[PDB]
């Protein structure tokens, strides 16, 4: 059962709904509403991510894709100034990004009913193989964030699992590094694509609220 | 008076529901309908561009945004191979693009009610100043695919005219580029951004469909 697999890899993993409801939740006590709220995300624009949104879109109203190739936000700090635009007259906003795979009904990670994230997979097997382009521009974007992984990426036990571990992480980086030079609530982790009759998964690693000046107002991590 | 500008500049803007009538109207004889259709866009993505998409998307049911900074569709074949997933069951791809401009209620090009396209016209002084970075990867192309246009640029008459078109120039040049290597039909042309209470408009460049192959079935221009 894939429910068994994800489990495993991921005990913290929490369904959509419980994901949705938790965040909701906790942002209440600050001033998030439905039609005061700009959600943006970032996350791989391959459709297996849309559930994500979907769920959190009936909670929050106007919605933003800030996600490239397999969930980085490199439309950067340009593109991020493009983001605060579209947020609501006293408005704030809350950032879903993360890294997403796929796990089968047969549980098998890096894949759900092809290669899922494809566009990581993809850089995996181009930054470890060499471990030992302005038509496809951000895929090597993508691959530049890798490249630091590679090592760990060889040594990993299960590779389609350390994968969107390490994307991430590398992610993570990006996103914070972007915020610190540009209030704004950020959610972060890995996102876990299963089979179209079963609940998506996902594993959050950072919850936390920052000011329009730039510093950590809260952690709920 | 701001048509008096928009007709001036450009004597062939559509209003958007003349674009959207339009279009739909002919690609009705090719089999698109509202829920068999991907409405893919590569605008820009500042708030003032959705008006197109608004208006587009009453008439086709979902949508995909592949646009980046500017409107370039910087997500290459990779991108497109994330967009081609979204296609319905026997469905078809409609792909909006193109490079957007405000001209405001005092009828002043490259801006409205701020600069308008701000990533163009910030790479527009970046490219012609020099005539004479993952955290911000994408206005780097966005330069990148304006340093051709230069000369033109220090040349032209009204620059804040003249961008947008040389903005299309090289949007055309590189969509072209991905789907050739990539039935899909292809809107192309200016975006024109106008006051709040007043209608936008879009200038027609290229209008034409594509077969899975990837020759030009059709062209409506
Ligand atoms: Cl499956
Ligand atoms: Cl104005
Ligand atoms: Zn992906
Ligand atoms: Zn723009």
Redesign the interface.
């Known amino acids: 059962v894939t429910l068994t697999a994800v489990k495993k890899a991921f005990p913290d993993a929490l369904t959509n709904a419980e994901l949705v409801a938790m965040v909701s939740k906790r942002l209440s006590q600050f001033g998030y509403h439905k039609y005061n709220t700009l959600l943006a995300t970032s996350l791989?624009?391959?459709?297996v991510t849309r559930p994500l949104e979907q769920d959190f879109g009936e909670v929050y109203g106007k919605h933003?894709?800030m996600g490239?190739?397999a969930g980085f936000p490199?439309?950067?700090?340009?593109?991020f100034?493009?983001?605060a635009?579209?947020i609501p007259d006293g408005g704030s906003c809350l950032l879903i990004y993360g890294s997403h795979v796929g796990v089968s009904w047969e549980g098998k990670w890096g894949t759900v009913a092809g290669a899922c994230c494809?566009?990581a997979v993809?850089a995996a097997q181009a930054v470890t193989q060499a471990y030992q382009?302005?038509?496809?521009?951000?895929?090597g974007?993508v691959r530049?964030?890798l490249r630091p992984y590679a090592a760990t990426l060889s040594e990993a036990e299960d590779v389609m699992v350390t994968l969107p571990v390490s994307v991430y992480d590398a992610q993570q980086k990006?996103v914070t590094?972007?915020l610190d030079?540009g209030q704004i609530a950020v959610v972060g982790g890995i996102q876990i694509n299963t089979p179209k009759e079963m609940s998506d998964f996902f594993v959050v690693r950072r919850f936390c609220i920052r000011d329009s000046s730039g510093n950590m107002v809260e952690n709920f991590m």
Chains 1, 2 share one sequence.
Not at 44 to 47: G, M, P, Q, V
Not at 133 to 139: I, V
């Open positions: 791989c624009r391959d459709e933003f894709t490239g190739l490199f439309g950067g700090l340009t593109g100034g493009a983001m635009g579209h494809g566009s993809a382009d302005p038509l496809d521009a951000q895929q974007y530049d964030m990006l590094r972007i030079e």
